[PDB]
Design an enzyme around this catalytic site. Structure first.
Site, PDB file in Angstrom:
ATOM      1  N   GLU A  54      11.974   7.268 -11.858  1.00  0.00           N
ATOM      2  CA  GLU A  54      11.071   8.561 -12.338  1.00  0.00           C
ATOM      3  C   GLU A  54      11.902   9.537 -12.635  1.00  0.00           C
ATOM      4  O   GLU A  54      11.778  10.583 -12.092  1.00  0.00           O
ATOM      5  CB  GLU A  54      10.056   8.727 -11.155  1.00  0.00           C
ATOM      6  CG  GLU A  54       8.687   9.516 -11.865  1.00  0.00           C
ATOM      7  CD  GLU A  54       7.767   8.767 -12.730  1.00  0.00           C
ATOM      8  OE1 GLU A  54       6.974   9.293 -13.271  1.00  0.00           O
ATOM      9  OE2 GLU A  54       7.713   7.668 -12.749  1.00  0.00           O
ATOM     10  N   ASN A 161       7.458   0.017  -4.794  1.00  0.00           N
ATOM     11  CA  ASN A 161       6.026   0.266  -4.719  1.00  0.00           C
ATOM     12  C   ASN A 161       5.258  -0.688  -3.988  1.00  0.00           C
ATOM     13  O   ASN A 161       4.096  -1.036  -4.339  1.00  0.00           O
ATOM     14  CB  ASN A 161       5.652   0.401  -6.288  1.00  0.00           C
ATOM     15  CG  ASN A 161       5.266   1.758  -6.830  1.00  0.00           C
ATOM     16  OD1 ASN A 161       5.119   2.658  -6.041  1.00  0.00           O
ATOM     17  ND2 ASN A 161       5.860   2.042  -8.322  1.00  0.00           N
ATOM     18  N   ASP A 232      10.886   2.307  -0.593  1.00  0.00           N
ATOM     19  CA  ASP A 232      12.139   2.271  -1.355  1.00  0.00           C
ATOM     20  C   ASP A 232      12.935   1.383  -0.274  1.00  0.00           C
ATOM     21  O   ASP A 232      13.014   1.466   0.578  1.00  0.00           O
ATOM     22  CB  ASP A 232      12.580   3.654  -1.751  1.00  0.00           C
ATOM     23  CG  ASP A 232      11.865   4.533  -2.441  1.00  0.00           C
ATOM     24  OD1 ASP A 232      11.897   4.428  -3.612  1.00  0.00           O
ATOM     25  OD2 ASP A 232      11.020   5.323  -1.818  1.00  0.00           O
ATOM     26  N   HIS A 258       9.682  11.335  -2.719  1.00  0.00           N
ATOM     27  CA  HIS A 258      10.674  10.173  -1.796  1.00  0.00           C
ATOM     28  C   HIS A 258      11.803  10.783  -1.507  1.00  0.00           C
ATOM     29  O   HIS A 258      12.268  11.940  -1.814  1.00  0.00           O
ATOM     30  CB  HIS A 258      10.945   9.204  -3.251  1.00  0.00           C
ATOM     31  CG  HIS A 258       9.797   8.574  -3.440  1.00  0.00           C
ATOM     32  ND1 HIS A 258       9.708   7.036  -3.107  1.00  0.00           N
ATOM     33  CD2 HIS A 258       8.601   8.782  -4.337  1.00  0.00           C
ATOM     34  CE1 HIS A 258       8.399   6.787  -3.796  1.00  0.00           C
ATOM     35  NE2 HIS A 258       7.930   7.763  -4.502  1.00  0.00           N
TER      36      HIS A 258
END
EC number: 3.1.11.2
Length: 267
Positions: A54, A161, A232, A258
């Site tokens: 991202e 995810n 993750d 994250h």
DNA sequence: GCTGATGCGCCGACGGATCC
DNA sequence: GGATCCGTCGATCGCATCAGC
């Protein structure tokens, strides 16, 4: 219950020393994360390889700090074509091969003795409106991963995810219809490990350790209460397990929703 | 050029019902 | 009647576009 990562095990269980440090990070927007001093954390961590997810940033807009990285100067970026998504791969050493796709979500890099895949797996979305695409994607990914031409072992890392099991999130009861903890996603993770085959590095070493999360929603101060998800991963071919020294969750490194994760391999 | 509104992708808290 | 289970709802960030000065 809060959590503190055990210290770094830099020696494989047979007793060989780590020679490769790999870090992965969903950065919640690369330009923001740089402004929030995330590049300072990278330099302190000194990884051999850095995988970002991202990025929300096309290559013409990469901040100049990024070409002040001399230990991570082979850089490869992939964004979607249609300021969203985006992944990046930075390496001390040039790879042998780099490819993209299986969307701006996957980078494949062939090194001397292994193949690194970094992935930003599509989200099933609020209300699950994108869950069926996710299941179709999961299957195309799997088939892609299995069909990797090289006989070299596979390292797959990044934002996958899904919280595989109930141990991987704070609220498994109330999230079983939520993105990232559906039976359809959990099943997908399960098939990937067996299909490919792959092992969950973090839980191969800490199979019973609760409360280890890599994600906390910005809302409701969920991070301060360590109410989070393990989204993750590092995933290894079975043959890379002897060379596995440690797999780390860097809970204290701020800058995204994250946290960084880090792999120590002894090659 | 720059700001702020708006749109979009990205669940934990809470209220109510059921169970022993 | 405390515990648990279930469905509902408000809401954090980064980045895009759009409107205006």
């Amino acid at each position: 219950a809060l959590y503190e990562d055990p210290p770094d095990q830099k020696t494989s269980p047979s007793g060989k020393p780590a020679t490769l440090k790999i870090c992965s990070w969903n950065v919640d927007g690369l330009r923001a994360w740089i402004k929030k001093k995330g590049l300072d954390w990278v330099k302190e961590e000194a990884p051999d390889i850095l995988c970002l997810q991202e990025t929300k940033c096309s290559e013409n807009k990469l901040p100049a700090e990024l070409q002040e990285l001399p230990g991570l100067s082979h850089q490869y970026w992939s964004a979607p074509s249609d300021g969203y998504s985006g992944v990046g791969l930075l390496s001390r050493q040039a790879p042998l091969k780099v490819s993209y796709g299986i969307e701006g979500r996957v980078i494949v890099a062939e090194f001397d003795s292994f193949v690194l895949v970094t992935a930003y797996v599509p989200n099933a979305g609020r209300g699950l409106v994108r869950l069926e695409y996710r299941q179709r994607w999961d299957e195309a990914f799997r088939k892609f991963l299995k069909g990797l031409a090289s006989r070299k072992p596979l390292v797959l890392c990044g934002d996958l995810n899904v919280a595989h099991e109930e141990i991987d999130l704070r609220n498994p009861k109330g999230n079983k219809k939520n993105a990232g903890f559906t039976p359809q996603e959990r099943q997908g993770f399960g098939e990937l490990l067996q299909a490919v085959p792959l092992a969950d590095s973090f839980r191969h070493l800490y199979p019973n350790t609760p409360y280890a999360y890599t994600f906390w929603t910005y809302m409701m101060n969920a991070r301060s209460k360590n109410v989070g998800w393990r989204l993750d991963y590092f995933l290894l071919s079975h043959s890379l397990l002897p060379a596995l020294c440690d797999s780390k969750i860097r809970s204290k490194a701020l800058g995204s929703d994250h946290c960084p994760i880090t792999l120590y391999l002894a090659l």
